[PDB]
């Protein structure tokens with residue numbers, strides 16, 4: 001017998017104590033080693049309700065990642081409420097590692113194993129676990145990187161699809177590689193990303209067909225974002241400590257929906273902090289080749305309003321709430337207290 005409850009979670013990881021990489025350092029001091037033989041119990045005849053959009057596990061992960069970045073990735077100047085903070089901004093070793101979230105005694109984590117679970121409502125195939133799977137704390141907008149893939153069909157997630165103000169999370173069932181590079185040898189902030197156009201356009205066509213099922217077979221249209229902060233209008237992410245901002249106009253070009261697509265990118269020092277603490281200037285990029293190859297496993301979308309009297313629905317890449325990134329991985333888990 002159990003009931004829905006929130007409690008203090010702890011973390012587990014396979015971090016190395018001898019690593020200078022910042023995720024390793026944080027996890028060494030903030031997490032315990034992983035269980036080599038974890039137990040999972042599949043529950044029979046058990047129906048449980050989940051709600052990925054109201055899940056305290058997400059708030060707790062957010063607190064961890066904020067703490068990690070605060071101790072690791074420090075900007076040269078910080079612009080809060082008018083209180084300017086100047087500090088050292090050393091270049092670091094940066095590469096996210098999987099973090100597991102675990103319940104203490106008296107509690108357990110229920111896991112939804114339904115193949116086409118959208119994140120809310122009843123789940124039929126439920127199991128109980130001690131810890132989540134390993135989740136990499138990848139901070140990004142527009143595209144979700146290095147995550148897990150949907151097991152069967154592409155999944156559309158939203159707290160309320162009818163509400164255009166609510167962010168849509170697209171969970172891909174097939175990853176697409178994105179290859180981003182700041183070449184060695186001169187604009188030190190000029191970079192680019194390479195993507196297989198045949199792979200991407202095929203996947204995007206499938207996303208269109210899935211969106212049709214949720215929007216009464218209306219015509220599905222992709223468009224680049226219309227105004228807003230750079231973090232939202234561009235695909236922003238962190239590669240080896242450096243903030244990349246990439247133009248994704250070529251990715252959301254309803255025309256193609258086959259060669260190599262090259263997105264123009266820029267390394268930015270002055271950014272709007274995802275933590276929500278204002279503007280900050282980080283250190284200039286390191287020398288040499290800066291490269292990150294990532295799997296696109298999800299897309300963050302925002303639907304246009306004002307289209308109720310037409311046969312079209314328009315979607316633009318979005319983001320800005322990093323909690324949605326954690327939701328995209330934590331959707332199938334909830335904490336319950338054992339009586």
Ligand SMILES: N=C(N)N[C@@H]1Cc2ccccc2[C@H]1NC(=O)C(=O)Nc1ccc(Cl)c(F)c1
Pocket residue numbers: 139140141228229231232236237238243244271272273274275276277319320321322
């Ligand atoms: N939606 C907006 N225009 N701003 C939102 C609004 C809001 C509310 C609460 C906390 C934050 C934020 C803003 N979000 C950000 O500044 C942001 O996500 N920045 C950012 C910077 C770097 C990278 Cl690599 C990245 F992935 C994201």
Ligand SMILES: *[C@@H]1O[C@H](CO)[C@@H](O)[C@H](O)[C@H]1NC(C)=O
Pocket residue numbers: 113114115116124125
């Ligand atoms: C529930 O579990 C059974 C047995 O593994 C599986 O055949 C079925 O597809 C599952 N149902 C859903 C909704 O995934």
Ligand SMILES: *[C@@H]1O[C@H](CO)[C@@H](O)[C@H](O)[C@H]1NC(C)=O
Pocket residue numbers: 146147175294295
């Ligand atoms: C990239 O995608 C491939 C294919 O799914 C996967 O095997 C690999 O682990 C992914 N790399 C990651 C998660 O960084």
Ligand SMILES: *[C@@H]1O[C@H](CO)[C@@H](O)[C@H](O)[C@H]1NC(C)=O
Pocket residue numbers: 152153154155173174206210
């Ligand atoms: C991904 O899901 C779609 C349905 O949304 C399905 O048609 C397609 O076969 C799936 N792709 C893979 C690789 O399983």
Ligand SMILES: *[C@@H]1O[C@H](CO)[C@@H](O)[C@H](O)[C@H]1NC(C)=O
Pocket residue numbers: 118119120121122156157158161214
């Ligand atoms: C998810 O499933 C629930 C229960 O069937 C349903 O009410 C809701 O509309 C679904 N959400 C999405 C995004 O399809």
Ligand SMILES: *[C@@H]1O[C@H](CO)[C@@H](O)[C@H](O)[C@H]1NC(C)=O
Pocket residue numbers: 160161162163164
């Ligand atoms: C979903 O959004 C629509 C449009 O804003 C709203 O009318 C409706 O009440 C919402 N549904 C729920 C269950 O909140």
Ligand SMILES: *[C@@H]1O[C@H](CO)[C@@H](O)[C@H](O)[C@H]1NC(C)=O
Pocket residue numbers: 179180181194293
């Ligand atoms: C990434 O792109 C560069 C050229 O831009 C190439 O040398 C490298 O092999 C690519 N990496 C992968 C994994 O394809």
Ligand SMILES: *[C@@H]1O[C@H](CO)[C@@H](O)[C@H](O)[C@H]1NC(C)=O
Pocket residue numbers: 196197198199202
């Ligand atoms: C791009 O992806 C397709 C599959 O969609 C693959 O057959 C092709 O080899 C890829 N192109 C390159 C240059 O690797």
Ligand SMILES: *[C@@H]1O[C@H](CO)[C@@H](O)[C@H](O)[C@H]1NC(C)=O
Pocket residue numbers: 213215216217
């Ligand atoms: C979309 O089209 C299919 C047939 O191609 C139909 O079965 C389905 O009901 C349609 N969905 C709608 C109209 O919402």
Ligand SMILES: *[C@@H]1O[C@H](CO)[C@@H](O)[C@H](O)[C@H]1NC(C)=O
Pocket residue numbers: 233234247248249
């Ligand atoms: C992205 O590139 C396109 C094509 O050059 C340009 O029209 C658009 O303004 C760019 N978007 C942003 C947000 O810079």
Ligand SMILES: *[C@@H]1O[C@H](CO)[C@@H](O)[C@H](O)[C@H]1NC(C)=O
Pocket residue numbers: 249250253255256
């Ligand atoms: C859309 O793709 C086509 C490919 O022929 C290109 O000509 C056009 O300029 C693209 N539009 C963009 C990138 O906004």
Ligand SMILES: *[C@@H]1O[C@H](CO)[C@@H](O)[C@H](O)[C@H]1NC(C)=O
Pocket residue numbers: 095096138145146237238239240291292293294295
């Ligand atoms: C995604 O994972 C790969 C493999 O670990 C890594 O090399 C790459 O830097 C990651 N991308 C991001 C944005 O963290």
